[PDB]
Amino acid sequence: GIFGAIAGFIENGWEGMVDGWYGFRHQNSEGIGQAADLKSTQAAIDQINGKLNRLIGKTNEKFHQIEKEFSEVEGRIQDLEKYVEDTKIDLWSYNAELLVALENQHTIDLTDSEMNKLFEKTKKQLRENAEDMGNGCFKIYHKCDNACIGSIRNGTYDHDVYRDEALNNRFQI
């Protein structure tokens, strides 16, 4: 939420992207295509796995403790045993609730971040050859076949090759 991409300027997710978490759709002369971006996908996944590594399979060993159920009325010592346990449980219950709320807010934010970073990187790559339409799509002002699109997705697109064509199309009357 905090970066404004996911559930923001990107209108919705893609149910048909099943091989990654982030990616590219395009329309060009050769049709309409989709490809996942593995590096952004792995960046988000590695962070979430980092949280899981800190939460799953990490338990503490305890052995002999105090009694926690009683069949007789006893007064002062029993009151104290019960209060100690109730105190402990409330403090752990608080910790658990807060942990999950904070971590979830952060997961939502870091996943939005990864989307934004991919968008920004792509924008910079295109230089003066494209304009941002505001909905996560770029209008590319030159002929850009499947190999050209591939070049953008692989970080190898050379903007200088198309700059003259693009400027002429963009800044027309």
Binding site: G1, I6, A7, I10, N12, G13, W14, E15, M17, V18, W21, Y22, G23, F24, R25, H26, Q27, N28, A44, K51, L52, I56, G57, T59, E61, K62, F63, H64, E67, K68, E69, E85, I89, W92, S93, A96, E97, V100, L102, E103, N104, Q105, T107, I108, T111, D112, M115, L118, F119, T122, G136, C137, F138, K139, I140, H142, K143, C144, I149, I152
Partner: protein, 317 residues
Amino acid sequence: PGATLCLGHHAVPNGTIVKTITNDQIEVTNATELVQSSSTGEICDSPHQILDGENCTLIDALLGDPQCDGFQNKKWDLFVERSKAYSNCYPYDVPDYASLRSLVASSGTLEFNNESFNWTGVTQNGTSSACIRRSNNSFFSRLNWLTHLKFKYPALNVTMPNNEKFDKLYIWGVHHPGTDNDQIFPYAQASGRITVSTKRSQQTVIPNIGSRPRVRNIPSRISIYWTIVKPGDILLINSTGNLIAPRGYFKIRSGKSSIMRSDAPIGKCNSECITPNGSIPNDKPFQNVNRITYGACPRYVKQNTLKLATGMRNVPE
């Protein structure tokens, strides 16, 4: 014509609802449960050494009630006491029962060493019909009911040094008679006194004659006491009657042992975390099965579910 290039992200048809700092319900693509809320209902016999008490409480197995003879010298990580347990020997009480139960539970052993006390002047091995062992009248196996020899019970003044590396635990008792007849028949004199001492401690106990409600037909009682004797200290027992003497000492260990009340069956399986409801998996950090646990266990919390997001916000088409 040019081209269009759109950046985006996945979504799923079946998202899950989680809580955040700013929203109590937001849908994400995937989540995982952090609270363990189920058990199989069995206590796994591995990898902890489980001792099923069956009909016996720990204290009954300690004193040596006849039905508990199979427990002699056993060790445990976890002793399991069942709600069907019952005593079937001479009726007794333990002032501070809960402490003796605790200190034996955490020691984790019933290892017992016989000692030869010099009981000259009295009749050893007193027995009762309230404590049947193999059809015969009997008594607690670890205790020695001393009575008169030829209608005399002289003062006892008996010593036992601790020359070991470890603390010795001595269990002993006083017989409180139901009537005057229950005092005369065994000791054949007015009144007893017991003083049990060490260099560092002393305990004196007086029998109190009086009718108590009959338990397994007996209106008398035994009151059970204990004494720990350190290395280099000496046990001294001074009695004029009514002494339920020790036959020796228990080893007291330290380590990870405990005791739990449960009616769950023991199963052949392997689980690190035991609750009275059964063993539970310990992959999750939290659990709401039971506040009582033993082993490598999730921490008990009040919530029955806490879902951790493992994916982005779900924004379906």
